Amino acid sequence: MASISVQYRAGDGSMNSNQIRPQLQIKNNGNTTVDLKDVTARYWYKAKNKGQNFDCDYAQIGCGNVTHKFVTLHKPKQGADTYLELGFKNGTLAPGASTGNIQLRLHNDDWSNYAQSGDYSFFKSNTFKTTKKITLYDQGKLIWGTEPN
């Protein structure tokens, strides 16, 4: 019954640099509140069996209220062999409200370059745009977007 979506843009920088820079917002489009602790988001990309590392640079809700982990896929899919899963410690969204910006950076253990063109969830855009390629979940159940096949 919760209805949420994600707005996204890649942070400024080369798609071939040593950092992925997902910038996200989650919006409540429904007529219920949303408890962010129950919400997770997944950004799907290719890490090529390099260890991944996370930074939260800024979030309107406070970086200390965002959680993360990296999950390697059983086997690679087109556009993805891993996802970053974001979660939340606390917070709510009223109908129509947004988290506002969540600005992240990911790097490889060895600080080597990514080539992000192929990544399922990657897109360059001057503006935040709603995307179905970053998926959202309510207690682990898919409620926004489409997972890689």
Determination technique for this PDB entry?
Answer: X-ray
Exposure on the CB side of residue 92, measured as CA atoms within 13 A: 6
What is the Cα–Cα distance from 31 to 130, expressed in whole angstroms?
19
Provide the token pair at 49: 């069996």
The answer to whether residues 37 and 90 touch, using CB atoms and an 8 Å cutoff, is yes
Provide the token pair at 88: 């939340």
DSSP β-bridge partners for residue 140: none
What is the Cα–Cα distance from 59 to 78, expressed in whole angstroms?
30
Per-domain boundaries in the chain: 1-149
What is the Cα–Cα distance from 147 to 149, expressed in whole angstroms?
6
Q: What was the resolution (in A) of this experimentally determined structure? A: 1.1
What is the Cα–Cα distance from 42 to 136, expressed in whole angstroms?
7
Counting DSSP H helices and E strands in the chain, the numbers are 0, 12
Strands, DSSP E only, in the chain?
4-10, 22-28, 34-35, 39-45, 52-59, 66-77, 80-88, 92-93, 102-108, 129-130, 134-138, 141-144
Q: What SS3 class is residue 127?
A: coil
Q: What SS3 class is residue 3?
A: coil
Nearest to 6 by CA among 27, 37, 21, 22: 27
Q: Nearest 5°: phi and psi at 127?
A: -120, 155
What is the Cα–Cα distance from 37 to 16, expressed in whole angstroms?
33
Q: Nearest 5°: phi and psi at 57?
A: -90, -40
The answer to whether residues 1 and 30 touch, using CB atoms and an 8 Å cutoff, is yes
